[PDB]
Amino acid sequence: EKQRKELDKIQSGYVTERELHIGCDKPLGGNANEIARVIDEQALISPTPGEKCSTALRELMENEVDRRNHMMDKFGQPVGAREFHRLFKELRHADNEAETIERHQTRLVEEYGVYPSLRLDAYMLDDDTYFPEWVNALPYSIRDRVKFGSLGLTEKDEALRVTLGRMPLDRRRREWERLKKAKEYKAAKEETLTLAELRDARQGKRR
Amino acid sequence: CPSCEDRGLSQNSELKRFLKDSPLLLAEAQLQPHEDPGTIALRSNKLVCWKCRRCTYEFVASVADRFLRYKRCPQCTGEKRTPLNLLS
């Protein structure tokens, strides 16, 4: 709709009337260049439709694991010896896992200078250049948490990461810098509570 | 004390281009006499034997990593794991 409206409002020089010819082949002449400018702008600068995703989609992605855990906890047959042992092992070594991910993170930030701000920027831009080689070689159980576990992230931030990954790279960086400035201003303004946050705190609902 | 000199406890500034320009690192340096007379490029990384003032422990740390980043000795910050460093 918007493209049709603006392209019909553009009425500088329709002498050649070869819009279809220029759409199926090269241009007609260099003088009538307004249509060419508009076409190239709407083809490159204008973003692809439907690239932005909602946080409801990212929540529904993990809704599968949520439903699986709920069904298991509701209709779970008492586990056997090996399952009991695995559960006890995990419950006992959860603290060791937290300690070792903290040690990996502090070693990284002290020997390479990759601070949590840089780690969050890498998370949003979906770039692995901010991390050394051993980061991807870390154990898979902690490879995903050692990178983006310390810094705070929301479902909205994950959806924004997906939106960035879908959008082009220059637009990635520009929108990410804009959103980073916005988040810093939000952190500066977060001294007080808004009415919605007060209502949520009184109700007990956790976003 | 040497530890309180780097911070502003108690305008003009100059550039330090060698180990001799920094009087703090020159004291802890246990550099070998025959290898280098103190004309070590402070920006380049080179391994020299140090000797801390507190624990008096000898170790090997880079000159560029010692000045630019203020690396602490392994015994005073918890890597050598000596009785002075052990918790028990």
Partner: protein, 154 residues
């Protein structure tokens, strides 16, 4: 002493009548095939951009046309290669304040690599036919492998 036509081997010349007209809802549904994205087009466009930067995309197409040795199907192919460079991080789009038009700029992160590319590339009748073939990688996404056959017709 001419260099005319970097066309495709299989594609024939199409005849569109003069009174042809698209519907208001059919003209915005045209899907073009993905043009070549290869090292040859990317390096040709990088060299043209290193010669002329920053410059409007129309000026870039005019410079590519003026260049004798050109490996490009059409302005659509140039737009696709520009999209690839934009996604890879070679070119960015900045909007001027006086003209309110966008402009391609070489990324200062990759300027040295662009210089090395143009140096390694720089260190009579011609006709180049482009031939493509689709395939799918191990991940399960479609992509076209391309090649160029050159010949001197007199």
């Amino acid at each position: 002493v001419v260099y005319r036509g970097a066309k495709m081997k299989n594609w024939p010349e199409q005849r569109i009548p003069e009174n042809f007209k698209f519907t208001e809802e059919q003209r915005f549904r045209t899907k073009a095939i993905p043009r070549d994205v290869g090292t040859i087009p990317r390096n040709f466009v990088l060299g043209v951009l290193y010669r002329h930067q920053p410059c409007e995309v129309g000026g870039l197409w005019e410079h590519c046309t003026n260049d004798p040795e050109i490996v490009l199907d059409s302005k659509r192919h140039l737009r696709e290669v520009l999209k690839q460079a934009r996604e890879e991080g070679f070119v960015t789009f900045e909007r001027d304040a006086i003209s309110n038009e966008w402009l391609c700029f070489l990324t200062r992160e990759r300027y040295e690599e662009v210089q090395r590319i143009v140096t390694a590339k720089s260190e009579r009748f011609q006709q180049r036919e482009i031939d493509y073939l689709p395939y799918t990688d191990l991940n399960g996404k479609v992509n076209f492998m391309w090649w160029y056959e050159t010949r001197d017709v007199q």
